[PDB]
RNA sequence: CGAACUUCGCG
RNA sequence: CGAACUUCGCG
RNA sequence: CGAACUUCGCG
RNA sequence: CGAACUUCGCG
């Protein structure tokens, strides 16, 4: 089935042993795993992703690129790209089961293997990566995909424990109208927390953050 | 000292689009219009890639537990300033407000490489090779000499030295388990503060004890 | 820069 | 071989 | 990189 | 011979 993956990738390996190592977990072989390949692939793929991000982002400010990048190099996104290659069906593991972390690591090792096998040709590896994922990356960039925020994380928690969503109420507003300060109270059952910020939503996000831990705590 | 041509001579690369180089050397205060922030962002990823590629090829040991600390030092602001000095980068940085520090020099260093990359037509192979011509020797040397970030015991003694002009003391509290799988419990102490550390070796237990003590000294 | 020492990293 | 702390010497 | 003590494991 | 730890030597 190696040739099956090579086809989806659109690239034939000169050293199949290299591809195999990328697809192998530490358990299956304590001497030939993807660890070092994983290490290199992380930085290689990160470069590919950031190269796209800086060219296509609808906002070039650092505060804007950061959250998008965090999502673009996350385990979740890597798994989405991996699925396009049905990568999981090519991975070799001995112990237990395969999870998203393993698929993500392998996705990284896979690209490190292509890079090395091609004679450490970054441009070639990059173009091959883009041919397969540029479109999904650009859409993710345009749609502003980002990691789940607190308020959203919170309601998912409250929803599972008590089958109900939290409430927020404005306690007070300080400062001048052009520089207001908001104090919001997040509430679920009898658990309450305060949040402060430049906007209602920000004050809310912080209140939610504190209320999440106050919950996970007890 | 200031002419871009002088930096291009050090770089070993002449820009087609000079504004790209200028932007890379410009801080936000000097030109709110267009500064190096974006180039910096791209440069971070580019340089990280160049360094890690060397690391995985030349590190004595290929295990992640070994590579991670070398990488941490090799992509640190401190190392970037070391590389930057070979180009006397500080002399070409354009800033209007504030002083030129290591954070700015490090950021400019990243931006500079993003600029070369862009000017060459986003040629990753060419930019990498140009980066190696200047810094490969220094990077492999850092890798060979095992340069890493200061460890906890070392960080602790400096803190205790500065604060009380004395050094920490450690004592082996207990040792147990199979002789081929021992567990050590060590105590670290400075003044009235003491902590316990546990590990697979004496040094490791001590490191954990030093790490916890540092936190205690941070609280008070 | 040089010397002693303390702690640490790599081989 | 390499890094830093302290100290003395020296500039 | 190297030597030895203790222990475990493979032949 | 391989592995873990302890002490030590050289760079």
UniProtKB/Swiss-Prot annotation, chain B:
SUPFAM superfamilies: dsRNA-binding domain-like (SSF54768), RNase III domain-like (SSF69065)
InterPro entries: dsRBD_dom, RNase_III, RNase_III_dom, RNase_III_sf
Residues given in the record as Mg(2+) binding sites: 40, 107, 110
pH-dependence annotation: Optimum pH is 8-9.
Active site per UniProt: 44, 110
A biological process from GO: tRNA processing
Domain DRBM as annotated: residue spans: 151-219
Documented effect of changing residue 157 to A: No RNase activity, no RNA binding
Family: Belongs to the ribonuclease III family.
Quaternary structure and partners: Homodimer.
Protein name: Ribonuclease 3
Organism ancestry: Bacteria, Pseudomonadati, Aquificota, Aquificia, Aquificales
């Amino acid at each position: 089935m190696l040739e099956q993956l090579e086809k989806k990738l659109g690239y034939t390996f000169k050293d199949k042993s290299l591809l195999e190592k990328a697809l192998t977990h530490v358990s299956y072989s304590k001497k030939e795993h993807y660890e070092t390949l994983e290490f290199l692939g992380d930085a290689l793929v990160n470069f590919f992703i950031v190269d796209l991000l800086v060219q296509y982002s609808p906002n070039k400010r650092e505060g804007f690129l950061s959250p998008l990048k965090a999502y673009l190099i996350s385990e979740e996104f890597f798994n989405l790209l991996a699925q396009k290659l049905e990568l999981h069906k090519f991975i070799r593991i001995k112990r237990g089961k395969i999870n998203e972390t393993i698929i993500g690591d392998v996705f990284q090792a896979l690209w490190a293997a292509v890079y090395i096998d091609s004679g450490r040709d970054a441009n070639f590896t990059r173009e091959l990566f883009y041919k397969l994922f540029k479109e999904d990356i650009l859409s993710a960039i345009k749609e502003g995909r980002v990691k789940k925020d607190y308020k959203t994380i919170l309601q998912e928690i409250t929803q599972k424990r008590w089958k109900e969503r939290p409430e927020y109420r404005l306690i007070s507003v300080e400062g001048p109208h052009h520089k207001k300060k908001f104090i919001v109270e997040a509430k679920i059952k009898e658990y309450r927390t305060l949040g402060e910020g430049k906007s209602k939503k920000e004050a809310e996000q912080r209140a939610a953050e504190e209320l999440i831990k106050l919950l996970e705590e007890s």
